[PDB]
Design a protein around this ligand. Structure first.
Ligand code: 8F2
Ligand code: ZN
Length: 260
């Protein structure tokens, strides 16, 4: 990806991605708008299982598109299973997408409603051995999406907010151990699910999306700190990292299922 130049600007944004990543106009692209009235309850959907008790965070990195909190996935620790998933998916990293204003920022939408941000907890199917091989499979990844709305502060997120000053620009990373992702989950695990893809290039169609119905609340100060990050690297013209979200894509031949 040393030649990648896609971004979220006017000249390299989502509308341009298809030129280097033709799958952008594929049959199962993400994100999508979740029409709550069209989504059908699926009684066969088993309960979702989120086991982050042994999660081991290692580092936080500004990759120029977002910031990723990375976990040690060399062992079966933080895993996602159940729900529409068959097998075990291991947590590798989480990141967010947010806007320049509270009225936008999420990638998925609910009845066209846009949230201030969206958290993505990325997991890969252990039957494929590693992340690189998993992304080449239709059921290689499971991403748990959680909407963020602005209101009361999320205590469990503050540790992330305070370390952002150390990774302001692209390429910067910082030690980030002992962070518990369980502090970022809402109370309920009710969710919608559908087959889709990564929302950033290479836009591979390797994701089973599980989007929680209940958003979490974060404070205006917390999201404000997110908006102080930079897309550019150190010593380059300052480009605030905001609106790093891809808009809803055509649902096409897909059905969104509800666990409730
Ligand atoms: N938004 S999302 O669909 O949840 C998503 C999931 C995984 C990833 C991811 O973990 N990686 C690795 C880091 C990376 C760096 C880039 O510059 C980039 O353009 C994409 C990624 C993706 C990635 C996924 C699959 C193959 C290669 C890279 C990114 C986004
Ligand atoms: Zn994402």
């Amino acid at each position: 990806g040393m030649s990648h130049h896609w971004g979220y600007g006017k000249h390299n944004g989502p509308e341009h991605w298809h030129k280097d990543f033709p799958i952008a106009k594929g049959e199962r692209q993400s994100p999508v708008d979740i029409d709550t009235h069209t989504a059908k309850y699926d009684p066969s959907l088993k309960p979702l299982s989120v086991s982050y008790d042994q999660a081991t965070s290692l580092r936080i990195l500004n990759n120029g598109h977002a910031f990723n909190v990375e976990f040690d996935d060399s062992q079966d620790k933080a895993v996602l299973k159940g729900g529409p998933l068959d097998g075990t998916y291991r947590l590798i990293q989480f990141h967010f997408h947010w806007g320049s204003l509270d009225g936008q920022g999420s990638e998925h939408t609910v009845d066209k409603k846009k949230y201030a941000a969206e958290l993505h907890l990325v997991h890969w199917n252990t039957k494929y051995g590693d992340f690189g091989k998993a992304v080449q499979q239709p059921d290689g990844l499971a991403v748990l999406g959680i909407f963020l709305k602005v209101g009361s502060a999320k205590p469990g997120l503050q540790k992330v907010v305070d370390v952002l000053d150390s990774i302001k620009t692209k390429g910067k990373s910082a030690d980030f151990t002992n962070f518990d992702p369980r502090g970022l989950l809402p109370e309920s695990l009710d969710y919608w699910t559908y087959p889709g893809s990564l929302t950033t290039p290479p836009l591979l169609e390797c994701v089973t999306w599980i989007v929680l119905k209940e958003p979490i609340s974060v404070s205006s100060e917390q999201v404000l700190k997110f908006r102080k990050l930079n897309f550019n690297g150190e010593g380059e013209p300052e480009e605030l990292m905001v609106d790093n979200w891809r808009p809803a894509q055509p649902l096409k031949n897909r059905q969104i299922k509800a666990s409730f």
